[PDB]
Antibody
Framework: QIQLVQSGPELKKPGETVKISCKAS????????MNWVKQAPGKGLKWMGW????????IYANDFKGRFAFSLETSASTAYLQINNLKNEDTATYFC???????WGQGTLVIVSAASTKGPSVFPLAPSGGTAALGCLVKDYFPEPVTVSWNSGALTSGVHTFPAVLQSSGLYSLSSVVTVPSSSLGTQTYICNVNHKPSNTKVDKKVEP | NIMMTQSPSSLAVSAGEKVTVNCKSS????????????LAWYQQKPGQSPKLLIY???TRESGVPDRFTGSGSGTDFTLTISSVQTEDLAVYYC????????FGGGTKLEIKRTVAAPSVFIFPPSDEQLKSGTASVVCLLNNFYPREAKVQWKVDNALQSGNSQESVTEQDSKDSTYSLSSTLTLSKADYEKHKVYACEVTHQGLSSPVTKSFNRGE
């Protein structure tokens, strides 16, 4: 296992500074340049730059010329990317990517926003023909993501957790639904497990007709 | 600086058809002393980092299935999927790595299949939410193809325009269908002032529009 482990997601305010770390393991660190790649939500991949991991010399792409600093800690085989005076257009996922071969970090989502993190409220979506649908409405949280599972992960077939939408409030909202045969309600129990790590919210909501 | 133009930007293909993606570099990426094209092709799926398919224009990465092949040289490059599989829906990127890196714009691939009509379900707002002062009404369209669908909200026969948001799942990587939710938001006071909440669904698979509805209080 050669791998690149980037640090976790960030929520920062316009004007602040963020520093993303990329940990490499399994090969001689100083022998391969490291690239940084930006992906704005819904957009393509854009190469940001490259750092010589022996000498620490950075080379910046044209569009990444001012507030962007590549650095190293050779000792720890770790490359860093610092972004200064954050703007809304810096909201994106940031990847480190090693010269030569297939190796990419898992990505670091950075959210730039004046808005504060808020936990969701969870409401039941309760029940046709032969199939019954039920669900959970997870509404008014910030920022993404919420995860949803059912019956502690023992119900997967027929589950649909939709992509969240941004409400006019500035808060996010999603639904999770599952379809089962009508005859099966009433002997079976339906619990949606909702997790919103940024606010440290964990809810188990029982849904029934 | 070497620019990369990928084409088409978007395509829809039936499973089993051949897929072709083209990449033009503004300058050659054939390094003359080793006769190697400095060009890679990537697959990227939602929430994942991109996955290398092909490098030096036509060498497969290990573990990459046979149906993916790269060809071309100089400025013209093509990624071919000889028999596209249902799980291949993704965004595909070419990358030049001869002089810095430049990614193509990406090509989004989707799957076509036989028409499949949605199941429709309507959910009233729960009482727990009504205490909070907001009323959410949800319409679900389940496991249908194609994605194109009209979902009209009516409240006591009044067309609701602009107070609903739609959400669509990723296309299923096994059977190639979508599910869609439309959610109508109202105030508690507005909700409790009306009776008939209706979700009208028009879709190529239904022989005529389908309406799921409830009276507030049944």
């Amino acid at each position: 296992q050669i791998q690149l482990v980037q640090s976790g997601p960030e929520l920062k305010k316009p004007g602040e500074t963020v520093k993303i770390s990329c940990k490499a393991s399994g090969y001689t660190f100083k022998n391969y340049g490291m690239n940084w790649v930006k992906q704005a939500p819904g957009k393509g991949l854009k190469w940001m730059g490259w750092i010589n991991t022996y000498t620490g010399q950075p080379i910046y792409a044209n569009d990444f010329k001012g507030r962007f600093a590549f650095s190293l800690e050779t000792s720890a085989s770790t490359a860093y990317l610092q972004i200064n005076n954050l703007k809304n257009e810096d909201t994106a996922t940031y990847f480190c990517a090693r010269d030569w071969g297939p190796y990419w970090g898992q990505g670091t989502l950075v959210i730039v926003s004046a808005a504060s993190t808020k936990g969701p409220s969870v409401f039941p979506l309760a029940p046709s023909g032969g199939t019954a649908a039920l669900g959970c409405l997870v509404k008014d949280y910030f920022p993404e993501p919420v995860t949803v599972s059912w019956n502690s992960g023992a119900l997967t077939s027929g589950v649909h957790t939709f992509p969240a939408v941004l409400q006019s409030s500035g808060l996010y909202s999603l639904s999770s639904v599952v379809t089962v045969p009508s005859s099966s309600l009433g002997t079976q129990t339906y619990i949606c497990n909702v997790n919103h790590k940024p606010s440290n919210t964990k809810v188990d909501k029982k849904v029934e007709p | 600086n070497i620019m990369m133009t990928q084409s088409p930007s978007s395509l829809a293909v039936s499973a089993g058809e051949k897929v072709t993606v083209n990449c033009k570099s503004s300058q050659s990426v054939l390094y003359s002393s080793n006769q190697m094209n400095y060009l890679a092709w990537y697959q990227q799926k939602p929430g994942q980092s991109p996955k290398l398919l092909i490098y030096w224009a036509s060498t497969r990465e290990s573990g990459v299935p046979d149906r993916f092949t790269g060809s071309g040289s100089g400025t013209d490059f093509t990624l071919t999927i000889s028999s596209v599989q249902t799980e291949d829906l993704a965004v595909y990127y070419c990358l030049q790595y001869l002089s810095s890196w430049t990614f193509g714009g990406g090509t989004k691939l989707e799957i076509k299949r036989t028409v499949a009509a949605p199941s429709v379900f309507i959910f009233p707002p729960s009482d727990e939410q009504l205490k909070s002062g907001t009323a959410s009404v949800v319409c679900l369209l389940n496991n249908f193809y194609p994605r194109e669908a009209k979902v009209q909200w009516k409240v006591d026969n009044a067309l609701q325009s602009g107070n609903s948001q739609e959400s669509v799942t990723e296309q299923d990587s096994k059977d190639s269908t979508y599910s869609l939710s439309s959610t109508l938001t109202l105030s508690k006071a507005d909700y409790e002032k009306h009776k008939v909440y209706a979700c009208e669904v028009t879709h190529q698979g239904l022989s005529s529009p389908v309406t799921k509805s409830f009276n507030r209080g049944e």
